Design a protein around this ligand. Structure first.
Ligand SMILES: COc1cc(CCCOC(=O)[C@@H]2CCCCN2S(=O)(=O)Cc2ccccc2)cc(OC)c1OC
Length: 191
């Protein structure tokens, strides 16, 4: 056999590939990162608990048909996920500089949002149009009004938003179903 099938899983997104055994894994890794809107740089791919480098081939790693590659985010700065009283979770992927965003300020952000199955349902980067709103003003979902408070400019924060802080029993956009937990990465551009 010259080719094998591989599954890459990050716990949410799973993507299936068929790769020639002598092909470097770079293209597969890039494909998985692109599907999440992310750069390959912000991800780590493991096979049999060992990190894969882009130049390595399935042959190099003795991979077999239907083997699994696990995908993770690694932030060099570390990972601390905080649960709030409301059940919101936040994780500062990057901490910003300067003053913290406060309720009542108009902020400008970039964001991407996904379902817990990894499906991207929206991004400001799609129209390359930052999104502005009045923080704590009730014009965005509750999880955002709560979760963007405390961010600093240049910060990127990952919000995990339970449905009562999102779209609840209604869902939205022909994409988000009832009772869906939402994941956003939000970049604070200005406050
Ligand atoms: C369910 O409650 C509300 C929902 C909205 C939705 C419009 C604003 O959108 C958002 O809150 C979020 C965060 C800010 C960026 C855009 N989104 S969004 O979730 O990505 C919008 C979306 C796009 C595609 C499919 C489904 C949903 C506005 C609201 O206020 C006018 C709401 O009431 C507080």
């Amino acid at each position: 056999e010259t080719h094998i099938n591989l599954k890459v899983s990050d716990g949410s997104s799973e993507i299936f590939f068929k790769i020639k055994k002598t092909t470097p894994l770079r293209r597969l890794m890039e494909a998985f990162a692109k599907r999440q809107g992310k750069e390959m740089d912000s991800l780590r791919f493991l096979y049999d608990g060992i990190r894969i480098q882009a130049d390595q081939t399935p042959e190099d790693l003795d991979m077999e048909d239907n083997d699994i590659i696990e995908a993770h985010r690694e932030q060099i700065g570390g990972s601390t996920v905080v649960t709030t009283e409301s059940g919101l979770k936040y994780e500062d992927l990057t901490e910003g500089s300067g003053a913290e965003a406060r309720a009542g300020q108009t902020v400008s952000v970039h964001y991407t949002g996904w379902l817990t199955d990894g499906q991207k349902f929206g991004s400001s980067k799609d129209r390359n149009d930052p999104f502005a709103f009045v923080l704590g003003g009730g014009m965005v979902i509750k999880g955002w009004d709560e979760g963007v408070q405390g961010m600093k400019v240049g910060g990127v924060r990952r919000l995990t938003i339970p449905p009562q802080l999102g779209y609840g029993a209604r869902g939205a956009g022909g994409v988000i179903p009832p009772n869906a937990t939402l994941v956003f990465e939000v970049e604070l551009l200005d406050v």
